[PDB]
Scaffold this motif. Structure first.
Motif, mmCIF file in Angstrom:
data_model
loop_
_atom_site.group_PDB
_atom_site.id
_atom_site.type_symbol
_atom_site.label_atom_id
_atom_site.label_comp_id
_atom_site.label_asym_id
_atom_site.label_seq_id
_atom_site.Cartn_x
_atom_site.Cartn_y
_atom_site.Cartn_z
ATOM 1 N N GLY A 1 0.834 -1.209 0.000
ATOM 2 C CA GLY A 1 0.000 0.000 0.000
ATOM 3 C C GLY A 1 0.857 1.243 0.000
ATOM 4 O O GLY A 1 1.845 1.299 0.718
ATOM 5 N N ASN A 2 0.507 2.214 -0.847
ATOM 6 C CA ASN A 2 1.245 3.484 -0.999
ATOM 7 C C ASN A 2 2.576 3.415 -1.743
ATOM 8 O O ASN A 2 3.199 4.464 -1.961
ATOM 9 C CB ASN A 2 1.530 4.163 0.353
ATOM 10 N N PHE A 3 3.018 2.217 -2.121
ATOM 11 C CA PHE A 3 4.302 2.055 -2.790
ATOM 12 C C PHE A 3 4.327 2.675 -4.199
ATOM 13 O O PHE A 3 5.197 3.497 -4.498
ATOM 14 C CB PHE A 3 4.729 0.579 -2.823
ATOM 15 N N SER A 4 3.393 2.289 -5.067
ATOM 16 C CA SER A 4 3.383 2.830 -6.436
ATOM 17 C C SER A 4 2.982 4.318 -6.424
ATOM 18 O O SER A 4 3.589 5.137 -7.123
ATOM 19 C CB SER A 4 2.474 2.018 -7.355
ATOM 20 N N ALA B 1 17.182 10.970 6.894
ATOM 21 C CA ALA B 1 16.497 9.686 6.990
ATOM 22 C C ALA B 1 15.149 9.752 6.302
ATOM 23 O O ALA B 1 14.275 10.511 6.696
ATOM 24 C CB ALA B 1 16.324 9.293 8.446
ATOM 25 N N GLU B 2 14.984 8.936 5.273
ATOM 26 C CA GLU B 2 13.824 9.024 4.420
ATOM 27 C C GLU B 2 13.634 7.658 3.777
ATOM 28 O O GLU B 2 14.608 7.017 3.376
ATOM 29 C CB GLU B 2 14.055 10.151 3.404
ATOM 30 N N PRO B 3 12.386 7.191 3.692
ATOM 31 C CA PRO B 3 12.145 5.759 3.419
ATOM 32 C C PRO B 3 12.249 5.234 1.985
ATOM 33 O O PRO B 3 12.304 4.010 1.805
ATOM 34 C CB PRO B 3 10.718 5.550 3.935
ATOM 35 N N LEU B 4 12.309 6.100 0.970
ATOM 36 C CA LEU B 4 12.247 5.611 -0.418
ATOM 37 C C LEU B 4 12.736 6.581 -1.499
ATOM 38 O O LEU B 4 13.342 6.143 -2.481
ATOM 39 C CB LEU B 4 10.799 5.189 -0.741
#
Ligand SMILES: NC(=O)C1=CN([C@@H]2O[C@H](COP(=O)(O)OP(=O)(O)OC[C@H]3O[C@@H](n4cnc5c(N)ncnc54)[C@H](O)[C@@H]3O)[C@@H](O)[C@H]2O)C=CC1
Ligand SMILES: C[C@H]1CC=N[C@@H]1C(=O)NCCCC[C@H](N)C(=O)O
Ligand SMILES: [Mg+2]
Ligand code: NA
Length: 259
Positions: A61-64, A244-247
């Motif tokens: 969820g939220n990836f694309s 720091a950031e996830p993607l």
């Protein structure tokens, strides 16, 4: 294995905005400027096809949606295919994608169909967060601590060694630590004999991996690791400059590396 959850990706535009300000504070450059320094490239609205993938753990969820936002943020003309998997890849190519962006549980790649360049998220993420840490304007030292020497951490450390930094390394797995020391020539870090660093790079899936004894006031902690490598308490106490950031930063490294 260490996979994103949908909650890690909430309000990705704000997470990117905050990461980009922190990167500017630390290095004098925005994320695009870091990628220009790394790869010499800039975006010109290249068309990026984002393909959801259902294999293994499946669609996150939220990836694309997050990739759709990240790509736009850096000036790419992106879209997300209606179909997943191979049908989606066909759709992407048919609709004129120049760069394909897709991930399964083990590999997140960017493939530039026009020039054949292909990037893997793991080294690209390690390299860019190590580059950011390396560019800390007020470091006054070439010593850097790398915590976590796996798929992201090992290429980060390698990048720092190539940049002629004095690299200290630690991994809780002794075999990984040994692999890094004998293939990269890094100095093994001894937790029982710590020293302070103004530059720290962390790439583990664990909390509170950075001991107090290793922090100096205003040090940079550049970390793709999830969750956060340090407590709020220690962050505040030493005025740590956190990247720091996830993607999004890792994704930018992939995209600019294939241009
Ligand atoms: N922010 C981003 O854009 C990205 C984040 N990641 C995240 O980066 C992290 C690392 O990913 P990989 O390198 O692929 O994982 P990995 O499993 O290849 O390596 C992680 C390493 O950290 C070490 N480690 C674990 N706990 C430790 C501790 N307490 N002290 C020292 N070392 C410890 C492990 O021994 C392992 O070698 C994961 O949390 C992953 O989700 C990965 C890719 C992109
Ligand atoms: C930080 C990220 C990027 C690389 N590994 C982490 C990760 O969660 N990888 C799995 C991504 C799976 C995406 C899924 N197949 C989808 O298409 O929604
Ligand atoms: Mg990132
Ligand atoms: Na971490």
């Amino acid at each position: 294995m260490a996979l994103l959850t949908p909650d890690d990706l909430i309000n990705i535009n704000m997470q990117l905005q905050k990461a980009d300000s922190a990167v500017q504070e630390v290095t004098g450059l925005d994320i695009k400027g870091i990628c220009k320094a790394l790869y010499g490239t800039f975006s010109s609205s290249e068309k990026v096809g984002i393909v959801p993938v259902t294999s293994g753990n499946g669609i996150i969820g939220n990836f694309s949606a997050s990739l759709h936002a990240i790509t736009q943020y850096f000036g790419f003309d992106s879209f997300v295919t209606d179909m997943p998997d191979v049908s989606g890849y066909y759709e992407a190519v048919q609709n004129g994608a120049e760069i394909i962006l897709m991930a399964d549980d083990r590999t997140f790649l960017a493939h530039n169909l026009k020039n054949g360049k292909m990037a893997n998220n793991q080294p690209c993420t390690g390299i860019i967060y190590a580059e950011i840490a390396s560019r800390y304007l007020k470091a006054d030292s070439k010593d850097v601590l790398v915590v976590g020497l796996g798929k992201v951490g090992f290429p980060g450390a390698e990048h720092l060694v190539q940049k002629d930094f004095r690299v200290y390394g630690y991994d809780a797995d002794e075999t990984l630590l040994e692999r890094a020391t004998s293939n990269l020539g890094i100095i093994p870090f001894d937790p029982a004999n710590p020293k302070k660093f103004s530059i720290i790079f962390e790439a583990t899936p664990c909390a509170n991996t950075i001991p107090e004894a290793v922090l100096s006031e205003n040090c940079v902690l550049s970390t793709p690791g999830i969750p956060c490598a340090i407590s709020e308490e220690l962050r505040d106490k030493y005025e740590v400059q956190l990247i720091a950031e996830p993607l999004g930063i890792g994704t930018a490294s992939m995209l600019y590396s294939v241009l």
